[PDB]
From a paper:
Middle East respiratory syndrome coronavirus (MERS-CoV) and the pangolin MERS-like coronavirus MjHKU4r-CoV-1 employ dipeptidyl peptidase 4 (DPP4) as an entry receptor. To understand the mechanism of MjHKU4r-CoV-1 entry into cells, we determined the crystal structures of the receptor binding domain (RBD) of MjHKU4r-CoV-1 spike protein bound to human DPP4 (hDPP4) and Malayan pangolin DPP4 (MjDPP4), respectively. MjHKU4r-CoV-1 RBD is composed of a core structure and an external domain. The structure of hDPP4 or MjDPP4 consists of a α/β hydrolase domain and an eight-bladed β propeller domain. Both DPP4 receptors bind to MjHKU4r-CoV-1 RBM via blades IV and V of their β propeller domains, in agreement with the complex structures of MERS-CoV RBD-hDPP4 and Ty-BatCoV-HKU4 RBD-hDPP4 solved previously.
The crystals of the MjHKU4r-RBD and hDPP4 complex were obtained in 0.1 M HEPES (pH 7.0) and 10% (wt/vol) PEG 6000. The two MjHKU4r-CoV-1 RBD-hDPP4 heterocomplexes in the ASU are also similar to each other (RMSD of 0.787 Å over 944 aligned Cα atoms). The overall hDPP4-binding mode of MjHKU4r-CoV-1 RBD is similar to that of MERS-CoV RBD. As expected, the footprint of MjHKU4r-CoV-1 RBD on hDPP4 largely overlaps with those of MERS-CoV RBD and Ty-BatCoV-HKU4 RBD. As MjHKU4r-CoV-1 RBD is orientated differently on hDPP4 and MjDPP4, there are also interactions specific to each complex. The RBD residue D471 only forms a salt bridge interaction with hDPP4 R336. In the MjHKU4r-CoV-1 RBD-hDPP4 complex, D545 forms ionic interactions with K267 of hDPP4 and therefore D545 plays a similar role as E544 in the MjHKU4r-CoV-1 RBD-MjDPP4 complex. For instance, D471 on MjHKU4r-CoV-1 RBD forms a strong salt bridge interaction with R336 of hDPP4. H517N mutation on MjHKU4r-CoV-1 RBD significantly reduced protein binding and MjHKU4r-CoV-1 pseudovirus infection, as this mutation would likely break the hydrogen bonding between the side chain of H517 and the NAG linked to N321 of hDPP4. The SPR assay showed that the affinity of MjHKU4r-CoV-1 RBD to hDPP4 was about 20-fold higher than that of Ty-BatCoV-HKU4 RBD to hDPP4, implying the former virus was probably more adapted to human DPP4 receptor.
Residue numbers in the entry:
A (entry chain A), C (entry chain C): 38 to 766
B (entry chain B): 389 to 594
D (entry chain D): 389 to 596
Write the structure that this text describes.
């Protein structure tokens, strides 16, 4: 156009809101959606909606309901209020149970305050909640709680809940509870943090607080004492109101009891069969156990003939952890995603008693995940369409043929949609397809029987009418060939991009192991503003170590974090600037977390290509980060393993080379992930050398710096730094 | 003359993997006496009648006894699978044998151990990556190599024992997980009576 | 013209250094002086010298001698090595003792490592050291030590040493030991920190440390529980090597035991008479006790009729604490500086058992300190000459006729020397005069009998020759009138200063209670470089709250800190701008500690006078600072005292007004004085209101940021902030 | 009837500032029988003979007894200064009196207290801004106004006691400081025997 542009206020105040359609399947043909603060039910076949629960029915509760959970039988709703956040997924709150058909709030034997977790059984209206690191179970929402565990100790023993390193780098969740399908068994893990050292930092809180507060969390850094894990399964049907409950412990396989290990995956198969994945501390060896319930002794028996070893000799196991199994309806076979000897992750069909599997999928591409398993079909997401690793499409394969694969999403709108997310219903009767880009998000509803796109849920045409009178930037996704291998880049170009004029280049970088910054997803981000308003070329590059391109590219950074993936961004800038439309004297680089570590290593690399750079909460020394993440790619910091490279990779080593670049160092004082210690050691090295730089701390902010006021401040501050460094009025 | 039935009914009974064995030759037995001293709940014999074994002439009469919970009676049966037969005790069926699972009267000068205990796992972890888990099963009438780890019970259910195997047993390291079962109102025993013949005019008579 | 300017690298690398003449009087006619690392003894009357200790007599120790202390009889020298700084005055080190007579190192019964404090007796070679918070006494340097106390407990009980609040705000020293004049008695204080809350902060240490340390210091904030104090005296001659030593307790007067109180001064009068000064927690009421020893019982005796009461109705007592007494030889009378009925501090003459005292000096000026007392003359320093409160001169007054006062330093070199300090010999036969400015420092030696100048000890003519190559700035010390009252200011004028040309002005500020930033002291500082090289006028101003001018100007900010001292700095900058040599569009303000508080309160006032400002380790909320200092001027932060003024005077309340200025906030992470909490709450208030600002943290730096690398980094960072705000190349 | 001295021999004896006072009328005594029960270390009389004290007919007989360490025997001497004479006990010489410093062997049935204790300071605070400190000394043979502060020993040395006074008690704030003395091997006591005579009513004659 020749009018309005995407400004910094549009991104900070969310002027152009993207509509979403988030539904919760209740059955095989009825789903729940919230509109006008009214919880409704949409019959998948007719589309006819109905009022499930309205808005004014809670205008007398006197509390701010933060979330809600409806039991799988629809007879109760779990109301959550007094939400208080902890880490990325953990939080405690207060709960109440409102009966639906009786329309009365249950008042007997209420859920106690400060409840750490609560979950329904997958079928029915049974409840299990964690409180004071101890598990409780209510067979019915109006009867007294049954106490399962008695060893709950704060920061020491965890029952049914995860510690820090398991919540963040293993399970990606706070819950360590696992119901059996039909509600009979409740499998729970136990974590022991006795000899795990504690990270300590200050929380200053509100002005009213006279003395600051010291936060102490068990945090296993690189090479420190990791926690230990036990596994238990309890029968939730034979609870006794006069005797304590009894838990049966499942021991890790003998190949895991000889050293440090992790419980990394729990997956129920039948209703008397459960699969546990274990991973050694050196995460190059994992073995999966399969355990059946023994009615005679009441125990659980796992046979060695049912063990499946998933190891690797050039790297680790899995993308971030070994994949989960998808069993058949009888529990004698399953499907998992593993490398295919050439390095590409495809689906393998396993027999629970035969250690060898047969790959039902092959090619120079990767399966992203397994979404549904029917008696006839097996649906999966992949990046196979047009050979682009940055795309996602839904696929269908026949259980009998293995050669009749059908692109269920590709070419439904190929000019607008190349990134898909599917949400199946119960029994995989229907499914919702979520298109994330390159166009506006598109929500479609289908029917798995004959692929009948019956309804369109959200076309986001309301956001389209607004974006016509603004000068939106374009998004190019292409590739380059270095060392005879194809590496992908992506660029956000200013509107009315002239191919001959020189442009400022901001190199956005994460470059983490198994990362992907070049995709087809549509975003209204800070890069949108820098390209639309400031006319800056925002570019990313997936190099050695980026995922979804075979284990050949991904494992290039094994035991060498801070070498290849850093030089990729450097030499790419040589390739970027040589394209002719880039000001080879105004090239910046900015990153967060691992990306901040890369930006720091690049600015101190003496490459002479980058002018300035910003690093937000960066890693500085791998011995400062946690053990599960770091040791997966770095091993152990001992003079026998990879300590020599542990010391050869710190940002502080490159202190004297920061005399040639402008440097903006940002870090939140309450960061539980990348502790402030990391940035404090960077500044201490730059000061002791004689390097001037800009610094900015954010009081009581975490790894996200995502508080409403702090998020606007950090992006306003980085905008000033970029505009000054590029000499842009 | 009189056979010493006494060592079975004094002190604390050993565990399944730590069973004691009485071998008898040149003596006279009163088998109908010892069965009455207990509350017998199973008298299973193979190759001989339970009544015929109380009245016969044998060269050797061996008896293996141990503390065995009645709830685990499914795992002391012939051809049975489970940790009992694989890593603890497997009955030998080379000679006529009888199997007696009996509970003892309140006062029999026998002490109830802290709890019942059997081994859950007894494998040899070895290989070029310590990746081949080789479970070590016992021969019938033999002792498990994991017996030495804790021959008089376990401190609690799940105790992981570790030691190195010598070059005599080869391989790498032996790991063994134990299991604990609570003690019931009374203590429950288990006997395997084996009898042999041979043309040595016998010697063990009623 | 073609000359060089005083650069930032000259100030940072100490290119031009002031020579001093530090002497230690060992007698009435001899003093010690180190020259070329040789310790020389000089004869005052004549000037001949001899070598006392050679610059090579300690070269075979392998140690680096950090400091030394020669015993008063000259028989031993205490060597101090392995120095580790704690707070402002406290530290820890090892101690070797060298016998000067035997010319060998004392190796029997060595002083233990981690010794907290060592002190000789004032005469002889007795030693008292504090180790593990317990006091030990050595009669001879190579004999076993007597243990005086056994109650020493880290962070709980302090014997012979001070806690943080007593070291910082009461005694200004780590030592709590006070020998008797001839070494017979050892008087010490005991501090109990049982219920004192702890300030906690992280210390990151060197890069090799994997987990940060958490420093815990007993630190009483405003209104918090204060430490308790006890006083004891022990006879160092009756020390048996078979029975524990006995310490006599001197209790505080009954008017102090009724509530919380402090011990603020210890002064020995005779060999059997000691004078203690106690102070209530409400620091407008102090009591002086006089205690005599009797050898009949062995205990002490403080007559009630010998107590003295110094109280204030306009504010607090003394400048920071009550002044110390100066007793006559018999110890039955003393001279003390107290405030008169007009609020001016002059010398009163007390009889130990006569409640009324006689003022021997009067006028609209103040006595700074009593320096010597003979049987005929009393020597003191005052700001009377030419009515300048920023000057210092030595006066003597006849005790037979108080009208006979004589100035010994007014007319010596009145254009070069206006700020004097004096060092008298024993029995006051000679005195060294120390001139501080406004010219180069000048050190002379005189005799008291005829006030005859003996010789010039140091004239700094070596530096003078060097300083003529460089264009040095000048200094103007004048006054302006506000509400019919003279208020003094000083200005560092650039070289070749032009009354017709306009200059940018930087306001240097502290403005604390009883402060004085306008004086005649010569200083080579950052302001010298900013004026010589950047042609910036650097001004300071002593408004209401400043000292040495009467209580009406000083006790004006009583119970209202952050009010008139902030307004008067702004009013001074207004009056400076009406002058024709100040660009009223390029005015800045910077400060440290209280100056940071004033700078921040000024920048958030909305006056629109200042363009930018720098706050270094500022106080932000008076409930965050320690109790002794804060409650002295503000009171108790209680609804029944002055909590309303406690909350009306925060920097956080003025966050919105920072949108008008460019603000730079600097603070060290390891600040035990003004905790990083204070700047953490300022930055949080600016972020939650939309104010952009520049920041800088210094890892593991204290309230001084005085490490060589850090001190150079902050003054280089602050220089660029000013040169960009003043638009300087 | 006979004057019994049981409270001097049973129970735990009080401190010097809380001395118990027995007064005997219309009874008979055996003074030498009680001194035999102890190992006396001092028996100084004033106004009466150390022998005639045991043989005289008296109008009344009063005894002040308390726990007292032998290490502080100089502070109880006649005319002594110090904390004992000022804030604890001062012997009265209005009547003939004897002073006894005795050690009780384990043969007796009285128990050792936790420690010895006297008062270091007992003063009154009043006036403008609570500025007037008037030290409260005792008349001979009287109790300190600080006795009610701790009537069963001091918990620690240097214990500070403060409490508002009534108008009958003078007024102001009463401030007191206690001193604690370590307990000896045996029990050491202090007895102050005084004698009052009457014109014709001497009915506390001795036992024969
Ligand atoms: C979580 O793990 C800790 C250890 O990391 C467990 O605490 C340990 O408990 C055992 C059992 O008593 C103790 O170890 C040994 O105790 C004996 C005394 O019986 C002692 O002589 C040995 O030297 C050894 O310490 C000990 O109390 C303790 N060990 C520690 C803390 O290092 C704890 O039980 C575990 N929690 C669970 C499994 O729920
Ligand atoms: C330091 O002060 C504390 C607090 O007054 C003293 O501890 C007290 O000691 C007695 C013991 O019964 C009681 O007054 C309190 O119960 C104690 N308080 C606490 C907090 O423990 C301690 O004795 C003092 N130490 C010294 C050496 O004087
Ligand atoms: C010290 O200052 C305090 C507070 O400024 C004053 O104490 C006041 O004393 C009067 C009379 O005793 C009371 O009526 C007031 O309530 C007190 N003020 C407060 C805030 O409580 C007094 O000027 C000084 N006190 C002394 C002992 O000198
Ligand atoms: C929607 O369809 C379902 C189908 O079972 C029906 O039960 C419900 O009453 C319908 N609601 C409306 C409003 O038509
Ligand atoms: C499923 O639920 C039924 C209840 O009727 C229960 O009997 C059965 O054991 C469950 N199935 C399992 C545990 O596999
Ligand atoms: C053997 O035991 C039986 C038990 O019923 C008894 O009747 C019989 O007399 C016994 N014979 C012996 C001890 O010889
Ligand atoms: C100065 O000379 C005199 C002359 O005898 C001598 O006694 C004295 O010790 C000398 N002083 C010094 C410090 O050398
Ligand atoms: C008094 O006591 C003495 C003890 O020495 C005894 O000899 C005497 O008989 C007693 N007199 C009496 C009990 O009357």
């Amino acid at each position: 156009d020749s009018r309005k542009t995407y400004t910094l206020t549009d991104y900070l105040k969310n002027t152009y809101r993207l509509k979403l359609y988030s539904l919760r399947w209740i059955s095989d043909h009825e789903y729940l959606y919230k509109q006008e603060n009214n919880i409704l039910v949409f019959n998948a076949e007719y589309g006819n909606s109905s009022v499930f629960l309205e808005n004014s029915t809670f205008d007398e509760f006197g509390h701010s309901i933060n979330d809600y959970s409806i039991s799988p039988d629809g007879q109760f709703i779990l109301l959550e209020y007094n939400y208080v956040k902890q880490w990325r997924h953990s939080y405690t709150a207060s709960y109440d149970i409102y009966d639906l058909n009786k329309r009365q709030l249950i008042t007997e034997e209420r859920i106690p305050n400060n409840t750490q977790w609560v979950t329904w059984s997958p079928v029915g209206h049974k409840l299990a909640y964690v409180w004071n690191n101890d598990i409780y179970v209510k067979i019915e929402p109006n009867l007294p709680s049954y106490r399962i565990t008695w060893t709950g100790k704060e920061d020491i023993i965890y029952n049914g809940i995860t510690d820090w390193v398991y919540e963040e780098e293993v399970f990606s969740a706070y819950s360590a509870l696992w119901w059996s399908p039909n509600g009979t068994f409740l499998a729970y893990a136990q974590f022991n943090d006795t000899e795990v050292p504690l990270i300590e930092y200050s929380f200053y809180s509100d002005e009213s607080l006279q003395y600051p507060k010291t936060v102490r969390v068990p945090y296993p850094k690189a090479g420190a004492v990791n926690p230990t894990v036990k596994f238990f399964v309890v029968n939730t049907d034979s609870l006794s109101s006069v005797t304590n409950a009894t838990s049966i412990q499942i021991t890790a396989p003998a190949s895991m009891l000889i050293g440090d290990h992790y419980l990394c995956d729990v997956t129920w198969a039948t209703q008397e069969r459960i699969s546990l994945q274990w991973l050694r501390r050196i995460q190059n060896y994992s073995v999966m156990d399969i355990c059946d319930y023994d009615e005679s002794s009441g125990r659980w028996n796992c046979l060695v003939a049912r063990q499946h070893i998933e190891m690797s000799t050039t790297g680790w196991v899995g993308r971030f952890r070994p994949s989960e199994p998808h069993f058949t309806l009888d529990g004698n076979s399953f499907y998992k995603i593993i490398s295919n000897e050439e390095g590409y992750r495809h689906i393998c069909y396993f027999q629970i008693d035969k250690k060898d599997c047969t790959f039902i999928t092959k090619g120079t591409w990767e399966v992203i995940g397994i979404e549904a398993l029917t008696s006839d079909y097996l649906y999966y997401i992949s990046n196979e369409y047009k050979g682009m690793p940055g795309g996602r499409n839904l696929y269908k394969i026949q259980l009998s043929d293995y050669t009749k694969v059908t692109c269920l999403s590709c070419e439904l709108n190929p000019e607008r949609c190349q990134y898909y997310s599917v949400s199946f219903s119960k029994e995989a009767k229907y499914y919702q397809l979520r298109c994330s880009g390159p166009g506006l998000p598109l929500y479609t509803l289908h029917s798995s029987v004959n692929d009948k796109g019956l309804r369109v849920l959200e076309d986001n045409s309301a956001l389209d009418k607004m974006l016509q009178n603004v000068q939106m930037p374009s998004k190019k996704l292409d590739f380059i060939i270095l060392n005879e291998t194809k590496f992908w880049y992506q660029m956000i170009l200013p509107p009315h991009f002239d191919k001959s004029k020189k442009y400022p280049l901001l190199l956005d970088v994460y470059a983490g192991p198994c990362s992907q910054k070049a995709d087809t997803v549509f975003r209204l981000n800070w890069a949108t503003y820098l390209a639309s308003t400031e006319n800056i070329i925002v570019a990313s590059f997936d190099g050695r170590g980026s995922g979804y391109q075979g284990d050949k590219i991904m494992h290039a950074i094994n035991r060498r974090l801070g070498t290849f993936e850093v030089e990729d961004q450097i030499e790419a800038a040589r390739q970027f600037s040589k394209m002719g439309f880039v000001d080879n004297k105004r090239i910046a680089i900015w990153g967060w977390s691992y990306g901040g570590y890369v930006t720091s290593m690049v600015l101190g690399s003496g490459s002479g290509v980058f002018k300035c750079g910003i690093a937000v909460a960066p890693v500085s020394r791998w011995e400062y980060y946690d053990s599960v993440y770091t040791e997966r790619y770095m091993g152990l910091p001992t003079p026998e393993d990879n300590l020599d490279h542990y010391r050869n990779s710190t940002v502080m080593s490159r202190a004297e080379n920061f005399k040639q670049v402008e440097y903006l160092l940002i870090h939140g004082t309450a960061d539980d992930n990348v502790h402030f210690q990391q940035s404090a050691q960077i500044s201490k090295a730059l000061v002791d050398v004689g390097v001037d730089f800009q610094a900015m701390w954010y009081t009581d902010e975490d790894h996200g710096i995502a508080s409403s006021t702090a998020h606007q401040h950090i992006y306003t501050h980085m905008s000033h730094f970029i505009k000054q460094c590029f000499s842009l009025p | 003359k009189e056979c010493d039935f006494t060592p079975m009914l004094v002190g604390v009974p050993p565990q399944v993997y730590n069973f004691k064995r009485l071998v008898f030759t040149n003596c006279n037995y009163n088998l109908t006496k010892l069965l009455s001293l207990f509350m017998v709940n199973e008298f299973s014999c193979n190759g001989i009648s339970p009544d015929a074994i109380a009245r016969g002439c044998y060269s050797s009469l061996t008896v293996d006894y141990f503390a065995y919970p009645l709830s685990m009676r499914s795992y002391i049966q012939p051809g049975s699978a489970g940790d009992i037969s694989l890593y603890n005790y497997k009955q030998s069926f080379a000679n006529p044998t009888c199997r007696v699972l009996a509970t003892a009267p309140a006062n029999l000068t026998l002490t109830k151990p802290s709890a019942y205990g059997y081994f859950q796992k007894c494998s040899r972890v070895s290989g070029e990556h310590n990746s081949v888990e080789t479970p070590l099963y016992i021969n019938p009438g033999e002792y498990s190599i994991c017996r030495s780890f804790s021959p008089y019970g376990f401190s609690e259910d799940g105790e992981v024992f570790r030691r190195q195997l010598t070059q005599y047993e080869g391989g790498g390291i032996l790991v063994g997980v134990g299991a604990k079962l609570a003690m019931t109102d009374k203590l429950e025993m288990g006997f395997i009576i084996s009898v042999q013949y041979g043309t040595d005019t016998n010697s063990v008579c009623p």
